[PDB]
Ligand binder design. Structure first.
Ligand SMILES: C=CCN1CCC[C@@H]1CNC(=O)c1cc(S(N)(=O)=O)cc(OC)c1OC
Ligand SMILES: [Zn+2]
Length: 258
């Protein structure tokens, strides 16, 4: 009876195995754009993905994940609210059954069709496991997806999903450039939060870009053909793999922009 996104194992159940689900620093949140304050103390954000080394793509039964060689400083995030150097380790998505839902963060209660999470760890903690336990150990760059025009930089991901339909399947995914998933603007909101999946560690600095990327209906339809189930189990389409907004509690969301 392990965690998932169903009626019987979904986000309303996770607190029983992971009591921090009802904590003071949970993610995602609704971003109230009126409440969020411009922060002039935020340093320039640096998304340095030129030397990224993608390795594999994996269906983990929750999402699909692209992992990166993070054995040295290749693709890194620094600046903005961050101190020091955070290495890209993986990206994955969250998406819906319909184009009006799928994102984890919301913006003035607006849900997007999907959300991309680029997961990074603080190199002062030497590895991602040790980082994942420190209050400033992880940084996740969140990008909303809306349905409209195709995103050419996403198509190499969409075209391999056929090969990883079921939980436990992986494929080679070398020479993928995550710069092709970024919008033009790096305007962002930031707040202290958590992983949005078990174990829900309160160890994430969230950086959520204001500008969504457009993807086509054909691209998001391909996400919805994935399966939560393993090969030769009953088919359960991998859709609505998002946690809803959690209480903001005593936190401030800071904007990088006026
Ligand atoms: C080695 C453990 C820590 N690394 C770095 C932080 C997240 C990652 C561990 N967990 C994940 O890979 C993982 C993380 C997230 S999330 N939205 O970043 O919390 C989502 C997921 O699948 C919807 C994941 O797989 C279940
Ligand atoms: Zn995520």
């Amino acid at each position: 009876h392990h965690w998932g996104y169903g009626k019987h194992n979904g986000p309303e159940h996770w607190h029983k195995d992971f009591p921090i689900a009802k904590g003071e620093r949970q993610s995602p949140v609704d971003i109230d754009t009126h409440t969020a304050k411009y922060d002039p103390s935020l340093k320039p954000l640096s998304v340095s993905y030129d030397q990224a080394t993608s390795l594999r793509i994996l269906n983990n039964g929750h999402s699909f994940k692209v992992n990166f060689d993070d054995s040295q400083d290749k693709a890194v995030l620094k600046g903005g609210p961050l101190d020091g150097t955070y290495r890209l380790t993986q990206f994955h998505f969250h998406w819906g059954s319909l184009d009006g839902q799928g994102s984890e963060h919301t913006v003035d209660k607006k849900k997007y069709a999907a959300e991309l999470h680029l997961v990074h760890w603080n190199t002062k903690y030497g590895d991602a496991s040790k980082a994942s336990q420190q209050p400033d150990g992880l940084a996740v760059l969140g990008i909303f997806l809306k349905v409209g025009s195709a995103k050419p930089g996403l198509q190499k991901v969409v075209d391999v999903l056929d090969s990883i339909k079921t939980k436990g399947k992986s494929a080679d995914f070398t020479n993928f450039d995550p710069r092709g998933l970024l919008p033009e603007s790096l305007d962002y909101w930031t707040y202290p939060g958590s992983l949005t999946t078990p174990p829900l560690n309160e160890t994430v600095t969230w950086i959520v870009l204001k500008e969504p990327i457009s993807v086509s209906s054909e691209q998001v339809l391909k996400f919805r053909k994935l399966n939560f189930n393993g090969e030769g189990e009953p088919e359960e389409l991998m859709v609505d793999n998002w946690r809803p907004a959690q209480p903001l509690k005593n936190r401030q969301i800071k904007a990088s922009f006026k």
